[PDB]
Amino acid sequence: SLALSLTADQMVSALLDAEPPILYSEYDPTRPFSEASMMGLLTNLADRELVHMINWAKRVPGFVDLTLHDQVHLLECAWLEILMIGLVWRSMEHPGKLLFAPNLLLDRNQGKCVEGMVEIFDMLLATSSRFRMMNLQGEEFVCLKSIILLNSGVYDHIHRVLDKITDTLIHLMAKAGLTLQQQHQRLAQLLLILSHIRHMSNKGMEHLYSMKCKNVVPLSDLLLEMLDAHRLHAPTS
């Protein structure tokens, strides 16, 4: 695999170049927020983001070397995690708010629009704040997001690529002048946050594929199938 032979700088460059664009929501300022209108906004945004996520995934080193079924399985498992970590990244320079899009900047009170949403908004805000305090760098971000893609649905080629990203992460920390101890510690700190992202995703997904949330707004067939991928194993009512 040509991915395994990349250098750390080549790895970073490949991930930076593979970054998806920042989309705008179809936020309509003429009408008050309701539970339905709010869910429609976030669903529309997430749906258009999925198409760009798929193309981004193909450009993550090692990913395209997998069978289509493994590619499907990884994306089905990680999609909300990936959306969430993207959200907390771009929300970093906006304390107390969540930048879903440049024209959709929300605080936790606006999260109260949808039943059970403010709790996840609170965890996303805290995660964003945590990144801000760690001074998370963009190079470190693209490493983490790729780790989520490759890690979340795996349980030997993938593990080799995951080690490569680990090397890349350490390389970045060394280049930034961190001591050997500070490197292991920071690596540990970042990877432990991924457990929280997993937790946020599962909690959010549980609401998303609930019967109430699956009938408040129309969902695209793609998004619908991404949801079901998790929903099928959930308790049967």
Binding site: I54, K58, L68, Q71, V72, E76, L222, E225, M226
Partner: peptide, 10 residues
């Protein structure tokens, strides 16, 4: 046949 499966070929 899933749509995600389809899009991963475009």
């Amino acid at each position: 046949h899933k749509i995600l499966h389809r899009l991963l070929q475009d």
